[PDB]
Design a protein around this ligand. Structure first.
Ligand code: BTN
Ligand code: BTN
Lengths: 127, 125
């Protein structure tokens, strides 16, 4: 009874195993549903006031039904920001549209030691 | 890039380690290649579903920072929900602590909802 990649994507609300998304600040990501409830893809940060802008970072997560969680560690061949974000949220479908409402936490280096900042991102499915 | 070096940079001198949070929930973390973490999580927190049965976790680390997710589906119980934790490790002598915040996305009273909280994990060994 392992959910197929296509069954996992359809339970999320999208017709295809891969799907591309944009948030309110214009960051983009692509999500790929796999076996074992897996989520893979990449994330492109375009939000102002943050580093590691404009290049893809690996993303990994899990999904069940219309719920999802995924993490991005901010290191790639181009730039490092010494930080990690996780998003968690839920998809809503309407007509031909899909939205993911998420909250996120971002661990980063504090003064003395680590801190966790928070926020919210809403992603829309790029048709 | 090596699993042991990734584990050591997190603060733990083993690729496989076992942790417990303030509410008795447990997890095993396995550091793999390229920042990967994999393992299992057992929820023993009062006031939640899906208690006492292991769920897969996946995530990533950089240095002493970590993020990971658990989908609340397995052969024993399904809670139709997902949690992600994000936070940082701190190492005091032989003890190591992970300070995290989490979000649990679930089917709420009448629509999806996201509940927030904080877990601190200590190394069991
Ligand atoms: O500045 C950093 O430490 C790394 C980049 C973080 C970008 C954050 S992740 C949450 C939020 N949503 C985005 O689309 N970008 C920011
Ligand atoms: O009730 C559910 O929908 C699934 C179980 C949720 C358990 C949550 S996850 C965050 C918090 N920390 C724990 O150890 N357990 C609860």
């Amino acid at each position: 009874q392992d959910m197929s990649p296509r069954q996992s994507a359809e339970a999320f609300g999208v017709p295809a195993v891969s799907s591309s998304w944009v948030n309110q600040d214009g960051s983009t990501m692509t999500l790929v549903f796999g076996a074992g409830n897996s989520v893979s893809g990449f994330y492109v940060n375009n939000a102002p006031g943050f580093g590691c802008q404009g290049t893809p970072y690996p993303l990994v997560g899990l999904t069940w039904g219309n719920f999802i969680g995924f993490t991005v560690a901010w290191d790639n061949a181009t730039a490092n920001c010494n930080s990690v974000t996780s998003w968690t949220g839920f998809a809503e479908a309407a007509g031909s549209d899909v939205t993911i409402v998420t909250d996120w936490n971002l661990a980063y280096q504090g003064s003395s030691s680590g801190e966790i900042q928070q926020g919210s991102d809403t992603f829309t499915l790029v048709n």
